[PDB]
Scaffold this active site. Structure first.
Site, short mmCIF file in Angstrom:
data_model
loop_
_atom_site.label_atom_id
_atom_site.label_comp_id
_atom_site.label_asym_id
_atom_site.label_seq_id
_atom_site.Cartn_x
_atom_site.Cartn_y
_atom_site.Cartn_z
N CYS A 75 0.33 -23.30 -21.62
CA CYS A 75 -0.74 -23.09 -22.64
C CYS A 75 -2.16 -22.78 -22.06
O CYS A 75 -3.05 -22.17 -22.72
CB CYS A 75 -0.78 -24.32 -23.60
SG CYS A 75 -1.39 -25.88 -22.88
N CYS A 157 -4.58 -23.55 -24.90
CA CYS A 157 -5.37 -24.67 -24.50
C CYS A 157 -6.15 -24.42 -23.24
O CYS A 157 -6.00 -23.34 -22.58
CB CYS A 157 -4.45 -25.92 -24.27
SG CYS A 157 -3.51 -25.82 -22.74
#
Length: 252
Positions: A75, A157
């Protein structure tokens, strides 16, 4: 013929064969998706838009496909891009320094293809398909991309990179998929920073495009989500790529 129901290109020739062959190939390369049944993928894909009016498609139509294509890429290594496809893909092909949407199975299956069906019959329309502008926005292709790009941004992320075309006049463009979907789907609980790489065109000695008005706008937009902003000019895209492939030998 001379008329055409819709104003955009028809389904790409060989679309069923192509999508099945991409799935097979992708699931051969990527060990984490080596569990996927490609014929079930094709069927879930085709079920989203066959026998459906190509101006009435929903995110729900694609939910069985999104389920079968469920995948996690790291991520914290996501690369979003806008209007600069070639270089984003070349850059990720080098040593897999990041993942774009088109390096996921679902993005891979659909990249550069068109497709639609008919409300009338169960056949694929290889003659024309709704244009997002002249016909309707809720067409098979535009819906698909809107849905899978929301999901991909939602998954990101840490530090998220974005490559922008600095030739564009609107380098950040609120109407692009990046400006209308992805940016409003970066999660404030997970994303620390968004860093833009603004890609310079040809020759020029060139302006610092990180001070462009649309960049400052992007900056202040993503600050409401509590995401920090960083920006980097890429003055020379082919020497960038050169340095990426020849890591070490750091003339730079």
């Amino acid at each position: 013929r001379w008329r055409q129901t819709w104003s955009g290109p028809g389904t790409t020739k060989r679309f069923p064969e192509t999508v099945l062959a991409r799935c097979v190939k992708y699931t051969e390369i990527h060990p984490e998706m080596r569990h996927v049944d490609c014929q079930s993928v094709w069927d879930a894909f085709k079920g989203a838009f066959i026998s459906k009016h190509p101006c009435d498609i929903t995110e729900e139509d694609y939910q069985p496909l999104m389920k079968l294509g469920t995948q996690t890429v790291p991520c914290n290594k996501i690369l979003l891009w806008s209007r600069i496809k070639d270089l984003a893909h070349q850059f990720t092909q080098v040593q897999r320094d990041m993942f774009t949407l088109e390096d996921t199975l679902l993005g891979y299956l659909a990249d550069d293809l068109t497709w639609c069906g008919e409300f009338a019959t169960s056949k694929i329309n290889y003659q024309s398909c709704p244009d997002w502008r002249k016909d309707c926005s809720n067409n098979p292709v535009s819906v698909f991309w809107k849905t899978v790009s929301r999901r991909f941004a939602e998954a990101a992320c840490d530090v998220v990179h974005v490559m922008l075309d600095g030739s564009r006049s609107k380098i950040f463009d609120k109407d692009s998929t990046f400006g209308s979907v992805e940016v409003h789907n970066l999660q404030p609980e997970k994303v620390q920073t968004l860093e833009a790489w603004v890609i310079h065109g040809g020759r020029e000695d060139s302006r610092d495009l990180c001070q462009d008005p649309t960049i400052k706008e992007l900056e202040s937009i993503i600050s409401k989500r509590n995401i920090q902003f960083s920006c980097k000019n890429i003055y020379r895209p082919d020497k960038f790529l050169q340095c990426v492939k020849n890591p070490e030998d750091s003339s730079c």
